[PDB]
Amino acid sequence: CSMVLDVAFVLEGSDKIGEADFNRSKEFMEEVIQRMDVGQDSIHVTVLQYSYMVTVEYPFSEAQSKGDILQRVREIRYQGGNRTNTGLALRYLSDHSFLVSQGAREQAPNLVYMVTGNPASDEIKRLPGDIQVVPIGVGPNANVQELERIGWPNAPILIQDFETLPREAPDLVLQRCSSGEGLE
Ligand code: NA
Secondary structure, three states, X not given: OOOOEEEEEEEEOEOOOOHHHHHHHHHHHHHHHHHXXXXXXXXXEEEEEEOOOEEEEEOOOOOXXXXXXXXXXXXXXXXXXXXXXXXXXXXXXXXXXXXXXHOOOOOOOEEEEEEEOOOOOOOOOOXXXXXXXXXXXXXXXXXXXXXHHHHOOOOOEEEOOOOOHHHHHHHHHHHHHHHOOOOO
């Protein structure tokens, strides 16, 4: 995937996820960033972690080089919160992450890959259409119809478990990046 694109990664870092499975999420994300043409004139990346609260791990407003982003990702620490506040994470995207004042490019399309394994704890409001969300629902505890509503027009990418995530998901994520649509 090589294009002008503001990409967000949103990883659930709750206790229900656990440190092992969160690290699998991190490793999935690293592999995606490695495959993406991340650079000042191409793909830009923001990274969020959420559970009880939402942490901006890397804003668009910081250096948009693959090396700088990947190293910050390695430094991300599992929070292990007691909630899955997916609604709050989505509000961050619309009201903070994708603002020009926060480093987003006005003429770049917006794409979000959100990794979650549990039902939302909180109220979820539908995002403005200009923020495209591709939900990645991992494991048996994902609330699928909830993800379908968050994702529209994007079908959720359903992954059997966090072990499979870093192996299977990157290909699908990059296909969606380049074409602008999910498969079949
Ligand atoms: Na943008």
